[PDB]
C-alpha cells in the first residue's frame, strides 16, 4: 500500500511544532532586562502603552544572592535616569550630543548604569577585587615583569604617572586592574587591564582611551582596600569615553 | 592601537584552590595542583585537582579497556610491526562485525573485540554522564550540562547501537579508526541516497554553523566589553553593567533586537543541542523509514530539476 | 602541491559542480609517456592466404602472406623487443606450439580480435592492440593478482580493508575491489529505487565494496567521479554521463576477458606469472588505461592491422 | 606640521627619497632591457 | 614636478610610506613572476636551451 | 523604540563615512553611510533573486520555472564565459547578486565598526565577521580567480547549493581525506562541545537547585576541574571558543582554496607523502 | 647612492630589520631549491651522471 | 626616532652595506656555478 | 644585549672559529660524498 504521508514527513513537520515553540520561550528570556522599551509612544499616551512587542514580558524570576545579600528580580521597574545630553535634531531617531565636556558627560561611551554600591565577593566571603597590597599571597609569575613602578603613558606618549599597586582577583587569579599613582594630582587611581598594554622592555604601560592629563579625572576610590560594582563602572566607563572623546580625529568621519 | 585580551601579558600567581568544600559522602580530590606558564597566557594556569570516586573510577576503567583493544587490534592488524602501525596509523581500524553475525556476540576472531570495545566504551560514556551529574549536585548547580551531555549520548547511541539493532545487524554500527570512520560516513549517504536530502541532516548543519556563528558572536562581544568587566558573567547577570549594555546595543543596532547576558546563554545552548539532537533523529530514521533521501525529496517536492546536459543509456534496460 | 592555474572542463550543467580539474604540466608529461608507435608500412595483400601458405595458422588464416608476417613483425615490437621473434617461437621451427608463450600469444589474438570485434559498446572504433596492455613488455606492467593484505596473527582474521592501499588510491576502504568484481561478478548496485524502507536488503558493507571498486576505476582513468556521475543521484542513469554507460560494458569486457581469457590459460604459465594465492596475473581498468580516459590518449591503432579482428 | 617634522626635515627625506626611487627605478629598467633581449614579449 | 613637493612629508608620515612602499613591491613582485609563469614566457620548464630530463 | 537603558548611549559621530548625512537610527537599527550603502545592496540582490525566480533557467512558460522554495536557483555561468560577465540569463543575473551580497555584506561589517566607535568596545565582533566575509569570497572570488572562471562559484539555491557542494567534492574521490577539511571539522565540532559547556556552565550556576543562592566563580573553576582536572577560566572560555570559531572559518576556507588552485588529484592519494617517508 | 643614505637606521629599526632579512632569506632559499626541483632543472632525480639505482 | 645616535646609523650602515654586498657577492658566485653546470636560459 | 663591546669580541671569536670548523666537516663530508656517489 502507498501513502503520501510518511514518517519523515509527520517527524520534520513536528520539529517545526517545537522549534517555533522554543523560539517564543527565548524571546521572552531575551525581554528580562530593558523592557518595557522607552518609546515616545508611551510618553504621550501618558504611560498607558507599554512597548514591549511580541512575546510578552515573562513572569519575575528571582536571584538569590550568597552571603545574604539580598534578591535580585527579573524583570523589573527601573527608574528613569536623567540624560546629559541634548538632541542634535528635534526628529525621531536623532542622536545626542554631551553637555559640557565630554569626557566628564557621563553621556555615550563614558556613560554606565549605578551598579550596587558594594563589592563582588569570594566564596568565603572577602572583597574580591583586592590589591596585592592586600592579598600578600599573590605574587607575579616568574618569567613575567612587575608592572610595579613602571611608567604610565597616555595616547600621546606623555608621562601620566607610575603604577602604584596592582589589584588581583581573589577568585580566579589575575589583574584585573592596575593602581597607577597620578603624577598631577598624586591621587591613585584605578587603570583596567583592559585599556593597558605593556612595553616590556621599556617598562611602560600604553593607555591609548586617554590623554595623560585626562588622568587626573578618573573616578576615585571610596575606599583604598576594596572597589564595589559601582565604581568598577564609572572606572571602566570613564575610560571608554576616551576612545570617542579624547581628541577631535576620534569623533569621525574619515571622509 | 589598542589591548585585544587574547594573550595575558602579565601573570600573577597564587596558592592552588583546592575547590569548594563537597557535601559528606563524596571522597576527598585528588592530585597536587601544578602551574603552567604556557597555559596561563591563555587562560588558566593551574592544573588540577581531580575528582575520582567510584563512578568515575569505573568510567576510567570500562573506557580504557576499549580503547586498548581497539589499538592492540589495529596492531595486531599489521602484524605487530610498530613501525608499519605508524605508517598505516589513520588507515587502521577495528571492524564491525560481518553480517552473517547479525546481533549475536561475533567470534572473537571476527567482529568480537569491536562488539567488546563498543559496550565497553558505551558504559563507560554513560558512567561519565552520571560523573557530570554528580559533580552539579555536589556544587548545589542545576544539571544543563548533564541534559546537554545526554543529547549528544543519545546520537551516539543511535550511530551505533539503536540503528544497527533496529536494522538486524551489528555490521551497519560504525568501525573504529581515524579514515575508516569516513568511509563510513560517506558510505552511509551512498548507501541511503544522498544524506544532503535528509531535511534533519539539514537541520543538523544548520545548527552546526549557528553554533560557530553563536560562539564567534558571543565570544568577540564578550571579549570586546571585557574592558567593562563582561567576562564576568555572573555578577552582569545579577547585576547588569555597561558591559551587558553595551553588548545588547551593538546587536539591537545592528540586526534590530538582542538578548541578555544570560538568555545568550539559553540561544548557545540550545543551538548545540539541536545538533546533535537532530542528527540522531535523521540518522535514526534512514534504512528503518527512508531508504533513499533523494527520492523521499522527489516524492514531497523538493529536489531541484536542471536542463538535461548529460544523460546515460541504462544498460539494464536495453 | 600544486600550482595554479589548474586545467579545467565543464561536465554538467552551470551551478551543478559536474567539473574536471588536471595539472596542465602533469598532462603534457602523461602525453609523451602514452605515445602509440607508427604504425608499419602498408603490406602486400594479395597472392596465397596464410591458411593455405603455413603449417599451423589456427586463428589468422585469412590474412596474405605479407599481411601475417607484418603482423608477426608488429607483435615483436609491442610485446618482446627485446628478445625478437623467437620470445614465441622454437628456434628453427615456427610451427611448433612447444613453448608457453605461442599458445599464450594464439589466445591473445583472440582476445584482441573479440574485444575489436564484439566489444565495441565499450573499444567503440579505437580498439585494442597488444601494444595497449604489454607497451613493449613480455608481461604487461599494469596487471594484478589476489591481493592478501597485510599480515594478521593466526588468531584474528583480516577484514580486507584499513590498510593504506595504492589499488583504492589510498583510502582505508576495501583493498582487493579487482577480485570480486572485475574477475567474479558481484553486485555492485546497492541504491534504492523507493523512498521508504521496505525493498533494499542492500548494506553498508556492500557500499563500502562499491565505493572502493569505484576509486580503483577513477584512478584507472584519471578522472573524478563526475566523469560518469551526477553525484546527488550516483544509481540514476538519466542524470549520469555517457561515459557511465560506456564503463558498464567495459566492467563485463574486463569479467569476460579474465573469466574466459586469461584464467583457462593458468595452466600452461610459469609459476613466476602466478601470485600468492596461485591465480594468474590478470586485466584490469588499469592494464589499457594506465591513468588515461582513453588508452594512449585514444591513438587509433588497431584500424591499421586487419589481422587483429574477426574473420 | 602633520607629521613631526621640520621644513628642513622634510626636504631632507625628500632628497633622499627622490634619488633613492630613481636608483630603484633604474634598477628595474636595467632588468626589462635583459629580459626584453633575452625573451621580447610584445 | 612643483617646487614645493616635499611638503608631502609635512603631512605624510615617512615610516608608513617606505614600509607601505616595500610591502607592496615584495607582493608585486612575487605576483608578477607567478603570473608570468603561469604563462608562455614561462623560463623554467620551457626546455631552453636544453631538456635536462632527457639527459637519462 | 528604545531599551529602558539606551538613550544615554546614543551619541553623534563615531562614523567612518557619511557623518552627520546618515547619522541616525531608524526604530532600533542604526543607519549610517553603510546602512544606505548595505540597505541598497541588499534590497537589489533580494529583488533579484525573486526576478530569477520569477524566470527560472529557460523561461517563466517553462517547466523548470517554480517558486518552489527548495528548487529555486540562480546558477552562475558556463565555465566557456572564464572571468568575463555573461549575459543575464546565461549567469550574469548571478555574478551582480554576488556583487551584491559582496557589497552588503562588507557594509554590514563596517556598519559594525561604526557602532563599535559610538559604544567605545572592541573591534572583536567585525573582526570577526570578516572571517566568515574571507571564506564567501573565496568561495566566489579567489577560487574561481585562480582557476579562471567566474563559474566556479556555487548556485544561489537552498537545495541546488548542496548539489554543488556534492559533485565538487567527488571531483576528488573521497573528499573526507582533505587535510584542511579534517582540521576545519575538528574545529567545527570543538566549537560546537566548547559551547554546549560554557553555555550550561553559566546557566546552572545563575539558575542553582532550589534553596541555593547563586552560585560563584569559585563555582566554576571547581566544576571542571572536578570533571577534567582542569578549568580554563571564565574570560579564556570566550578567547577560546573565538579562536575555536575563526579557525573553523579559516580552514574551511583553506580546504576549499586547495581543492582545485593547489591539488587536482584525489583527496587520499595526497596522504601519499606520509606513505612514502623513507622511514617504513 | 646618496651621501646621507646611512639615516634610514634612523628610521627603521636596525635589529627588526636585521631579523626580517635572515627569516626572508631562509624561507626564499627553501622555496627556489623547490620550485627548481619541480621543473626539467630537476638535479637529484635525472639519472646525471649516473642512475644509481640502475646499479643494483 | 629608531633611538640610534647619527654616529651609530652611519657606523650601523657601513657594516649593513658591506656585509650585504658580501652575501650578494655570494649569490653571484653560486649562480656563475650553476649556470655553467645547467644553463637555465 | 647587555654583553659588553669585549663580550662581544670574545664570543665572536669562538663563533668564528667554531663555524668555520663545523664548515670545514661539511666540506670533507661533502668529498668524500663525492668521490663514492657524484651527483652532478
Ligand atoms: C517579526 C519582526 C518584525 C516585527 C515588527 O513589528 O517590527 C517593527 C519594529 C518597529 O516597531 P516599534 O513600534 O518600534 O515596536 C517595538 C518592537 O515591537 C520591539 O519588539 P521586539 O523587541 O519583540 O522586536 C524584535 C523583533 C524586531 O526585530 C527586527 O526588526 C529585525 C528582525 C529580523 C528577523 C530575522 C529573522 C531571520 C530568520 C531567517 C530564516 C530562518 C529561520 C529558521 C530556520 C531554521 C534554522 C535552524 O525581532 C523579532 O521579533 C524576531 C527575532 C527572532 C528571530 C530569530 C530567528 C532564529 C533563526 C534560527 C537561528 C538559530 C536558532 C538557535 C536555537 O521594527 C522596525 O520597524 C524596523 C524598521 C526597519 C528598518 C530597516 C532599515 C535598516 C537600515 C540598516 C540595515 C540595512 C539592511
Ligand atoms: C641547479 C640547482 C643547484 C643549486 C644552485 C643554487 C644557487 C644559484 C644558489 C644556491 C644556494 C644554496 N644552495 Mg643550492 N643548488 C643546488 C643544490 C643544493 C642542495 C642539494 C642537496 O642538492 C643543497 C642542500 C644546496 C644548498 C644551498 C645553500 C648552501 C644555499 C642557500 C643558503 C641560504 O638559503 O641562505 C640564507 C641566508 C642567510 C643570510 C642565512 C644566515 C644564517 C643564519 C645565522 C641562520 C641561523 C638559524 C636561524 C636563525 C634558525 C631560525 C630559528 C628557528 C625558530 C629554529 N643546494 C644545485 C646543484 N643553490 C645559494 C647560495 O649559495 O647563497 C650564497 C645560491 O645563490
Ligand atoms: C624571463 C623572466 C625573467 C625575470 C625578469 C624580471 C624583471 C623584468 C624584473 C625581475 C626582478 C626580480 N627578479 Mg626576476 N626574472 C626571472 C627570473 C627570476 C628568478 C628565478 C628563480 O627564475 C629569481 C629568484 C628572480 C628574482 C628577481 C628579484 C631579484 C627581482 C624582484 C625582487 C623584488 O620583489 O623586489 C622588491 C625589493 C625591494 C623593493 C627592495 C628595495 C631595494 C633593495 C635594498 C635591493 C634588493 C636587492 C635587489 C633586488 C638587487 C637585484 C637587482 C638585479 C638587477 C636583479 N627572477 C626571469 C629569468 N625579474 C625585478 C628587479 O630586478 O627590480 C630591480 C625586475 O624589474
Ligand atoms: C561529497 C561532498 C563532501 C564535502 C565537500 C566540501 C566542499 C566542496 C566544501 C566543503 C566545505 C565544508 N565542509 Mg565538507 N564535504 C563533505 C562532508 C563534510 C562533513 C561530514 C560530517 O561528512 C562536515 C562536518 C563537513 C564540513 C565542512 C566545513 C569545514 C566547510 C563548510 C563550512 C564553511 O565553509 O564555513 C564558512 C562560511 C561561509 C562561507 C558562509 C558565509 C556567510 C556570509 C558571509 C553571510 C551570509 C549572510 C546571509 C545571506 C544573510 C541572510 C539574512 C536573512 C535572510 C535574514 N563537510 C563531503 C565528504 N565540503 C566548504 C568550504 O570549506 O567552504 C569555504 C566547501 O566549499
Ligand atoms: C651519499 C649519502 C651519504 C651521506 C652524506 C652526507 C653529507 C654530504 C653530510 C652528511 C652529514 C651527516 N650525516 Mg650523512 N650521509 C650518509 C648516510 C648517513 C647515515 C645513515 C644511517 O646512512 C647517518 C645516520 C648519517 C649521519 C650524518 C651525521 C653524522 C651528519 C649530520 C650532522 C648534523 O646534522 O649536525 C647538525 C648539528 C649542529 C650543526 C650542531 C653543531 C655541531 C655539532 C657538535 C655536530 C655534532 C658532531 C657531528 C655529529 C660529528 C659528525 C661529523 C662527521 C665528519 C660525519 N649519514 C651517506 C653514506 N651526510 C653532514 C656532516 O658530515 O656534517 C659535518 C654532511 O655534511
Ligand atoms: C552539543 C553536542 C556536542 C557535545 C556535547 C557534550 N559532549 C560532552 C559533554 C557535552 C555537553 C560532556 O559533559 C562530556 C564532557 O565531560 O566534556 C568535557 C562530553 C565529552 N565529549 C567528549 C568527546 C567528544 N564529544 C564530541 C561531540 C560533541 N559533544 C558535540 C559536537 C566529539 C566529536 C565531535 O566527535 C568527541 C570526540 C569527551 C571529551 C567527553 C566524554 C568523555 C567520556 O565519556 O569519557 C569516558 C570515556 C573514556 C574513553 C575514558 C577514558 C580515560 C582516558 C583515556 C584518560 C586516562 C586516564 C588514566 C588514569 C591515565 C593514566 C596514565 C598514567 C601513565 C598516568
Ligand atoms: C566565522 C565564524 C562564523 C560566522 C561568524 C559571524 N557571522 C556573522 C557575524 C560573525 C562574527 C556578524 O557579526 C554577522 C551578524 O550580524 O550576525 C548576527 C554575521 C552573519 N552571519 C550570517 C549568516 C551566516 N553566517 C554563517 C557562518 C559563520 N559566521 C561562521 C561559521 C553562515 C553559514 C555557515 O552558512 C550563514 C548563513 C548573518 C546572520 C549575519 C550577516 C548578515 C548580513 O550580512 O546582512 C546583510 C545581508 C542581508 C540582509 C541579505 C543579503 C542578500 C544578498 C544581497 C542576496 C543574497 C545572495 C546570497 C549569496 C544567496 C545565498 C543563497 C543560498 C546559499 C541559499
Ligand atoms: C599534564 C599532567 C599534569 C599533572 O600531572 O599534574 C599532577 C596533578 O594531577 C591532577 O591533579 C589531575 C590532572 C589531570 C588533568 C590533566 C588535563 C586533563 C585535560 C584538560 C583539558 C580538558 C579535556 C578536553 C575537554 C574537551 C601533578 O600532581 P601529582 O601527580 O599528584 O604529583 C605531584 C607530587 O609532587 C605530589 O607531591
Ligand atoms: C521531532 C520531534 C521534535 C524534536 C524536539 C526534541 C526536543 C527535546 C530534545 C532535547 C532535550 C532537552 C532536555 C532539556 C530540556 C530543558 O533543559 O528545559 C528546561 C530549561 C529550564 O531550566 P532553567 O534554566 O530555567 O532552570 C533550571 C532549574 N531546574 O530550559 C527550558 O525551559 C527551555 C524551554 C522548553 C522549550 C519549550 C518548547 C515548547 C514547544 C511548544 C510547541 C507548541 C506547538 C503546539 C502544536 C499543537
Ligand atoms: C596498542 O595500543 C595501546 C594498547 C598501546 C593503546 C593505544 C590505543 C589506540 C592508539 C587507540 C586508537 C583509537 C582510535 C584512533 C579510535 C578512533 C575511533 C573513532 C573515530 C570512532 C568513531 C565512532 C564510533 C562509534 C560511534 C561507535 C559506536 C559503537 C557503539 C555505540 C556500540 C555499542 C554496543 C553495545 C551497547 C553492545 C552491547 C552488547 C550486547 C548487550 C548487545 O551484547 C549482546
Ligand atoms: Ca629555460
Ligand atoms: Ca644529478
Ligand atoms: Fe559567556
Ligand atoms: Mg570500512
Same mark, same amino acid.
Given at each position: ?255 | ?43 588558566? =594556569?593551574?592544573?588540577?585537582?581531580? *575528582? !575520582?570516586? %567510584? ?7 570500562? $573506557?580504557?579497556? &576499549? ?82 551531555? =545526554?543529547?549528544?549520548?543519545?546520537? *551516539? !547511541?543511535? %550511530? ?7 536494522? $538486524?545487524?551489528? &555490521? ?147 | ?311 | ?42 | ?56 | ?280
Amino acid at each position: 500500500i502507498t501513502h503520501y504521508i510518511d514518517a519523515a514527513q509527520i517527524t520534520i513537520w513536528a520539529f517545526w511544532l517545537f522549534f517555533f515553540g522554543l523560539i517564543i520561550y527565548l524571546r521572552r528570556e531575551d525581554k528580562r532586562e530593558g523592557y518595557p522599551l522607552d518609546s515616545d509612544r508611551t510618553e504621550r499616551s501618558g504611560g498607558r502603552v507599554k512597548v514591549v512587542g511580541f512575546p510578552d514580558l515573562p513572569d519575575p524570576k528571582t536571584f538569590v544572592l550568597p552571603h545574604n545579600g539580598g534578591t535580585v528580580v527579573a524583570p523589573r521597574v527601573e527608574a528613569p535616569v536623567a540624560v546629559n545630553a541634548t538632541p542634535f535634531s528635534p526628529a525621531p531617531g536623532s542622536p545626542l550630543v554631551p553637555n559640557g565636556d565630554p569626557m566628564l558627560s557621563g553621556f555615550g561611551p563614558a556613560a554606565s548604569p549605578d551598579r550596587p554600591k558594594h563589592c563582588d565577593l569570594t566564596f568565603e566571603g572577602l572583597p574580591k577585587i583586592v590589591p596585592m597590597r592586600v592579598a600578600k599571597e599573590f605574587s607575579i609569575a616568574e618569567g613575567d615583569p612587575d608592572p610595579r613602578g613602571m611608567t604610565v603613558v597616555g595616547l600621546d606618549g606623555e608621562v601620566a604617572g607610575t603604577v602604584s599597586d596592582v589589584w588581583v582577583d581573589r577568585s580566579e587569579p589575575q589583574i584585573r586592574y592596575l593602581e597607577v599613582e597620578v603624577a598631577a594630582n598624586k591621587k591613585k587611581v584605578l587603570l583596567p587591564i583592559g585599556f593597558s598594554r605593556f612595553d616590556k622592555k621599556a617598562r611602560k604601560v600604553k593607555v591609548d582611551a586617554i590623554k595623560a592629563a585626562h588622568f587626573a579625572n578618573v573616578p576615585t576610590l571610596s575606599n583604598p582596600d576594596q572597589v564595589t560594582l559601582y565604581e568598577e563602572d564609572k572606572v571602566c566607563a570613564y575610560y571608554a569615553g576616551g576612545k570617542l572623546y579624547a581628541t577631535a580625529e576620534r569623533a569621525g568621519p574619515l571622509l | 592601537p589598542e589591548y585585544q585580551n587574547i594573550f595575558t601579558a602579565v601573570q600573577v600567581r597564587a596558592p592552588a584552590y583546592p575547590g569548594v568544600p563537597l557535601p559528606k559522602g563524596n571522597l576527598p580530590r585528588i592530585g597536587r595542583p601544578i602551574f603552567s606558564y604556557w597555559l596561563g597566557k591563555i587562560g588558566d =594556569a593551574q592544573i588540577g585537582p581531580i *575528582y !575520582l570516586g %567510584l563512578t568515575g573510577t569505573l568510567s576510567i576503567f570500562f $573506557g580504557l579497556v &576499549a580503547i586498548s583493544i581497539i589499538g592492540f587490534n589495529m596492531l595486531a592488524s599489521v602484524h605487530w610491526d610498530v613501525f608499519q602501525f605508524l605508517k598505516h596509523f589513520f588507515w587502521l581500524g577495528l571492524e564491525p562485525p560481518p553480517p552473517q553475525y547479525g546481533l549475536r556476540i561475533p567470534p572473537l576472531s571476527e567482529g568480537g573485540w569491536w562488539l567488546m570495545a563498543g559496550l565497553f566504551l558505551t558504559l563507560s560514556i554513560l558512567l561519565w554522564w552520571v560523573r557530570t551529574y554528580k559533580r552539579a549536585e555536589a556544587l548545589g548547580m542545576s544539571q544543563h550540562l548533564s541534559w546537554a551531555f =545526554a543529547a549528544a549520548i543519545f546520537f *551516539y !547511541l543511535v %550511530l551505533g547501537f539503536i540503528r544497527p539493532v533496529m536494522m $538486524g545487524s551489528w &555490521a551497519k554500527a560504525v568501525p573504529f579508526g581515524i579514515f575508516p570512520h569516513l568511509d563510513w560516513t560517506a558510505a552511509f549517504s551512498i548507501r541511503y541516497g544522498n544524506l544532503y536530502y535528509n531535511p534533519f541532516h539539514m537541520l543538523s548543519i544548520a545548527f552546526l554553523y549557528g553554533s560557530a556563528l553563536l560562539f564567534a558572536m558571543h565570544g568577540a562581544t564578550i571579549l570586546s566589553v571585557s574592558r567593562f568587566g563582561g567576562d564576568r558573567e555572573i555578577d552582569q547577570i545579577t547585576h547588569r553593567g555597561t558591559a551587558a549594555e553595551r553588548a545588547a546595543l551593538f546587536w539591537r543596532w545592528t540586526m534590530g533586537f538582542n538578548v541578555t547576558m544570560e538568555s545568550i546563554h539559553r540561544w548557545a545552548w540550545w543551538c548545540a543541542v539541536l545538533t546533535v539532537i537532530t542528527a540522531g533523529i535523521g540518522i535514526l530514521l534512514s534504512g528503518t523509514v527512508v531508504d533513499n533521501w533523494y527520492l523521499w525529496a522527489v516524492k514531497h517536492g523538493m529536489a531541484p530539476a536542471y536542463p538535461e546536459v548529460v544523460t546515460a543509456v541504462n544498460p539494464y534496460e536495453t | 602541491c600544486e600550482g595554479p592555474p589548474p586545467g579545467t572542463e565543464q561536465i554538467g550543467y552551470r551551478g551543478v559542480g559536474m567539473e574536471n580539474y588536471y595539472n596542465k604540466r602533469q598532462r603534457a608529461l602523461s602525453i609523451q609517456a602514452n605515445q602509440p608507435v607508427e604504425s608499419l608500412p602498408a603490406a602486400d595483400s594479395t597472392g596465397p592466404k596464410a591458411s593455405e601458405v603455413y603449417q599451423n595458422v589456427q586463428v589468422l588464416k585469412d590474412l596474405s602472406v605479407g599481411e601475417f608476417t607484418r603482423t608477426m613483425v608488429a607483435v615483436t615490437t609491442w610485446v618482446s623487443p627485446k628478445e625478437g621473434c623467437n620470445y614465441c617461437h622454437v628456434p628453427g621451427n615456427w610451427a611448433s606450439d612447444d613453448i608457453y608463450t605461442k599458445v599464450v600469444s594464439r589466445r591473445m589474438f583472440e582476445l584482441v580480435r573479440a574485444a575489436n570485434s564484439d566489444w565495441k559498446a565499450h573499444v567503440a572504433e579505437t580498439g585494442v592492440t597488444c601494444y595497449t596492455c604489454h607497451r613493449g613488455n613480455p608481461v604487461p606492467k599494469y596487471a594484478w593478482v589476489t591481493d592478501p593484505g597485510p599480515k594478521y596473527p593466526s588468531g584474528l582474521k583480516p577484514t580486507g580493508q584499513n590498510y593504506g592501499s595504492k589499488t583504492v588510491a589510498y583510502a582505508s576502504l576495501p583493498f582487493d575491489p579487482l577480485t570480486p568484481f572485475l574477475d567474479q561478478a558481484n553486485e555492485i548496485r546497492i541504491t534504492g529505487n523507493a523512498a521508504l524502507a521496505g525493498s533494499n536488503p542492500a548494506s553498508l558493507k556492500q557500499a563500502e565494496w562499491t565505493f572502493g571498486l569505484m576509486m580503483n576505476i577513477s584512478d584507472s582513468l584519471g578522472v573524478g567521479c563526475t566523469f560518469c556521475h551526477n553525484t546527488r543521484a550516483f544509481n540514476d542513469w538519466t542524470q549520469s554521463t555517457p561515459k557511465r554507460t560506456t564503463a558498464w560494458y567495459a566492467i563485463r569486457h574486463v569479467r569476460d576477458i579474465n573469466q574466459n581469457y586469461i584464467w583457462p590459460l593458468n595452466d600452461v604459465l610459469p609459476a613466476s606469472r602466478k601470485g600468492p594465492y596461485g591465480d594468474p596475473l590478470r586485466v584490469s581498468c588499469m592494464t589499457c588505461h594506465q591513468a588515461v580516459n582513453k588508452p594512449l590518449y585514444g591513438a587509433q591503432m588497431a584500424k591499421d592491422y586487419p589481422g587483429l579482428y574477426k574473420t | 606640521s602633520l607629521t613631526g617634522l621640520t621644513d628642513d626635515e622634510a626636504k631632507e627625506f625628500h632628497a633622499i627619497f627622490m634619488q633613492s626611487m630613481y636608483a630603484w627605478f633604474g634598477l628595474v629598467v636595467i632588468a626589462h632591457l635583459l629580459a626584453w633581449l633575452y625573451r621580447p614579449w610584445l | 614636478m612643483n617646487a614645493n613637493l616635499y611638503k608631502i612629508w609635512l603631512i605624510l608620515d615617512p615610516r608608513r610610506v617606505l614600509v607601505s612602499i616595500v610591502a607592496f613591491q615584495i607582493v608585486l613582485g612575487l605576483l608578477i613572476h607567478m603570473i608570468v609563469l603561469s604563462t608562455d614566457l614561462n623560463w623554467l620548464d620551457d626546455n631552453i636551451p636544453v631538456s635536462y630530463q632527457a639527459l637519462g | 523604540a528604545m531599551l529602558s537603558f539606551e538613550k544615554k548611549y546614543r551619541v553623534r559621530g563615531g562614523t567612518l563615512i557619511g557623518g552627520d548625512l546618515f547619522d541616525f537610527w531608524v526604530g532600533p537599527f542604526y543607519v549610517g553611510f553603510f546602512g544606505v550603502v548595505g540597505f541598497c545592496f541588499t534590497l537589489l540582490g533580494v529583488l533579484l533573486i525573486v526576478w530569477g525566480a520569477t524566470i527560472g533557467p529557460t523561461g517563466p512558460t517553462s517547466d523548470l520555472q517554480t517558486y518552489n522554495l527548495w528548487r529555486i536557483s540562480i546558477a552562475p555561468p558556463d565555465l566557456s564565459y572564464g572571468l568575463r560577465m555573461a549575459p543575464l540569463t546565461e549567469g550574469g543575473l548571478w555574478q551582480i547578486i554576488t556583487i551584491c551580497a559582496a557589497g552588503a555584506f562588507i557594509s554590514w561589517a563596517l556598519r559594525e565598526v561604526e557602532i563599535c566607535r559610538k559604544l567605545g568596545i572592541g573591534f572583536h565582533v567585525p573582526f570577526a565577521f570578516s572571517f566568515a566575509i574571507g571564506a564567501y569570497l573565496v568561495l566566489v572570488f579567489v577560487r574561481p580567480l585562480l582557476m579562471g572562471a567566474w563559474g566556479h562559484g556555487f548556485p544561489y539555491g537552498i537545495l541546488s547549493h548542496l548539489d554543488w557542494v556534492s559533485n565538487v567534492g567527488y571531483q576528488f574521490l573521497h573528499f573526507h581525506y582533505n587535510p584542511a577539511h579534517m582540521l576545519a571539522i575538528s574545529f567545527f565540532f570543538t566549537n560546537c562541545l566548547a559551547l554546549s559547556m560554557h553555555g550550561s556552565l553559566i546557566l546552572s550556576v545563575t539558575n542553582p537547585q532550589k534553596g541555593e543562592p547563586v552560585k560563584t566563580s569559585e563555582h566554576e573553576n571547581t566544576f571542571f576541574r572536578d570533571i577534567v582536572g582542569y578549568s580554563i577560566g571564565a574570560l579564556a572560555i570566550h578567547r577560546l571558543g573565538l579562536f575555536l570559531a575563526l579557525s573553523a572559518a579559516f580552514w574551511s576556507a583553506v580546504c576549499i582554496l586547495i581543492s582545485g588552485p593547489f591539488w587536482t588529484r584525489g583527496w587520499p592519494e595526497w596522504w601519499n607523502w606520509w606513505l612514502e617517508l623513507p622511514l617504513w
